[PDB]
């Protein structure tokens, strides 16, 4: 199945991590844990803002422009991205904004980190209507020495 994984400020505001006003190493660990040994699909913006490829996974970059690195697979459409994953139980889609919009209709599962922060931005995770998505897991945490804000992990499954 196809899954989306995302870190969301309030009102579904998203961004590249290194520009967001927070430090959430716990989210980092949750991300690696839920993507480990799965193919990931990302947009070029996200690809750039992490420099290297995610280790041990098929890394698939969706871009209209030609590839600029041979350690990853470069595709030019949603269908091409999916096809390049071959036969696996789960594909992880890791952003960013337009990428999330494109894959949401094909996804059966969401992995979301809610972050207790208000941040200005023009990029948002797509609207996931409560009537369409069942919350099957929620795990609340508060701020500590390592994590700057309260954060809540959530998994939802398409009804």
């Amino acid at each position, epitope marked *: 199945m196809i899954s989306l994984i995302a870190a969301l400020a*309030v*009102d579904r505001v998203i961004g590249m991590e290194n520009a967001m006003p927070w430090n959430l190493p716990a989210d980092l660990a949750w991300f690696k844990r839920n993507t480990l040994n799965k193919p990931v699909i990302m947009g070029r913006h996200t690809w750039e803002s992490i420099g290297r490829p995610l280790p041990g996974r098929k890394n698939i970059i969706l871009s209209s422009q030609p590839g600029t690195d041979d350690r990853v697979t470069w595709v030019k459409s949603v269908d091409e991205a999916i096809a390049a994953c071959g036969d696996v139980p789960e594909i992880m889609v890791i952003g960013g904004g337009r990428v999330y919009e494109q894959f949401l209709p094909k996804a059966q599962k969401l992995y979301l980190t*809610h972050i207790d922060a208000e941040v200005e931005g023009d990029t948002h995770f797509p609207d996931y209507e409560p009537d369409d998505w069942e919350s099957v897991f929620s795990e609340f945490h508060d*701020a500590d020495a390592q994590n700057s804000h*309260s954060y*809540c992990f959530e998994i939802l499954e398409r009804r």
Partner: nanobody
Amino acid sequence: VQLQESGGGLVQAGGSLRLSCTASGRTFSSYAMGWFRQTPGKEREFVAAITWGGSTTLYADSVKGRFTMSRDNAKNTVYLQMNSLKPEDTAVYYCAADGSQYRSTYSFRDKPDYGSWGQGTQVTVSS
């Protein structure tokens, strides 16, 4: 999802009163919360709001610098600390939960959607 205001009663002008609002319902800590006040016959006035995790607040200009809203998710409670009260502050104060998850204080205030309301607590300031 259900709310109960507490605190409040008579206070002299210039004094302080602390209100609390306790919720029953497991999913409390995924909703913004707000305080409102109302005198008989008049529309509700927005007073304060706070995000789900309690880090970020928004205040009506009429109470800014005087009122502080805060939150304790481990106790399913939000509070309203009211200092330097005036006769004009006299009203029924209500607690309200957002109908939608994980919104900003701004959305809570400017795009109203109310999951539920408390029964209210009377706050009365003399002169």
